[PDB]
């Protein structure tokens, strides 16, 4: 929906451009600044909703404990769940940040500045990361004591 | 509505002058003879009226559209070039007697 709105807006801007009006680029720049501010606000809302969801559709990540050659092992390890969570948060961010810019390089091709366009500053970003660092920590904690049982094999009768 | 002194633009032409011409245009054939100075004035006003009325309607339309523009300030920046060319033509014309 965001891409469609941007496409229609860009089509209207191009229609203005072909009519050969006066002083287009500065108007385009100002409207781009406003639209990126609105994008930053919407990104803030989506990111905070995602964060509280962690604490917005989220994929369910699952990993197992197994044993082989009589050693306890994880599949995948806890850092892998960490990296999947980071990837999913990046995809959620990219939902808004991958949007193209409006014009008459890579940064110029599509808008990647909304993080600095943040209405509340990086806090909403940072707390999101915090949830990750929260959850994973708790995970390994619940793992740790349980994993302790493997010691039973390391001692022999 | 505004404390400032507005320098509203007008046209140096009373709309009622053509009215006088019509009186002459009617009285001349009624048999009454009018002073020749009045005849010349009425004839000149009658032949010059189209320019005056076109000018006044044009300036009124321009004022209406420009106030409509400035009502929505988000567009004046785009319209600036057209407003400049209009003001340039106005500047050229105002010098004329």
């Amino acid at each position: 929906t965001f891409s469609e709105i941007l496409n229609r807006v860009q089509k209207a801007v191009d229609d203005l451009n072909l009519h050969s009006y006066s002083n287009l680029p500065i108007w385009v720049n100002k409207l781009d600044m406003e639209i990126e501010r609105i994008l930053g606000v919407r990104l803030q809302a989506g990111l905070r909703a995602w964060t509280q969801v962690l604490l917005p559709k989220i994929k369910n990540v699952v990993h197992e404990l197994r044993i082989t050659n009589q050693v306890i092992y994880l599949n995948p390890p806890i850092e892998e769940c960490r990296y999947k969570l980071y990837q999913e948060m990046f995809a959620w961010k990219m939902v808004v940040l991958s949007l193209p810019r409006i014009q008459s390089t890579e940064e110029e091709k599509f808008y990647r500045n909304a993080l600095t366009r943040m209405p509340d500053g990086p806090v909403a970003l940072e707390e999101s990361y915090s949830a990750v660092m929260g959850i994973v920590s708790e995970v390994e904690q619940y793992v740790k004591v349980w994993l302790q049982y493997q010691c039973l094999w390391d001692m022999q009768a | 509505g505004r404390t400032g002194n507005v320098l509203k633009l007008k046209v140096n032409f009373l709309p009622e002058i053509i009215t006088l011409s019509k009186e002459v245009r009617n009285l001349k054939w009624l048999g009454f003879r009018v002073p020749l100075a009045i005849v010349n004035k009425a004839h000149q006003a009658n032949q010059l009226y189209p320019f005056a009325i076109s000018l006044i309607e044009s300036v009124r339309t321009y004022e209406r559209t420009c106030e409509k523009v400035e009502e929505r300030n988000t567009i004046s920046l785009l319209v600036a070039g057209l407003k400049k060319e209009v003001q340039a033509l106005i500047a050229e014309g105002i010098a004329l007697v």
Binding site: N23 | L7, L77, A80, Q87, I90, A91, A95
Partner: peptide, 28 residues
């Protein structure tokens, strides 16, 4: 050396232009 757009088209608010031309009419 990526050139940027120069000064944009100005507005030159109607009141100022009208005042200047009122002065010019007064002096002519």
């Amino acid at each position: 050396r990526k050139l940027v757009h120069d000064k944009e088209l100005a507005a030159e608010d109607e009141q100022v232009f009208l005042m200047k031309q009122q002065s010019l009419l007064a002096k002519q």
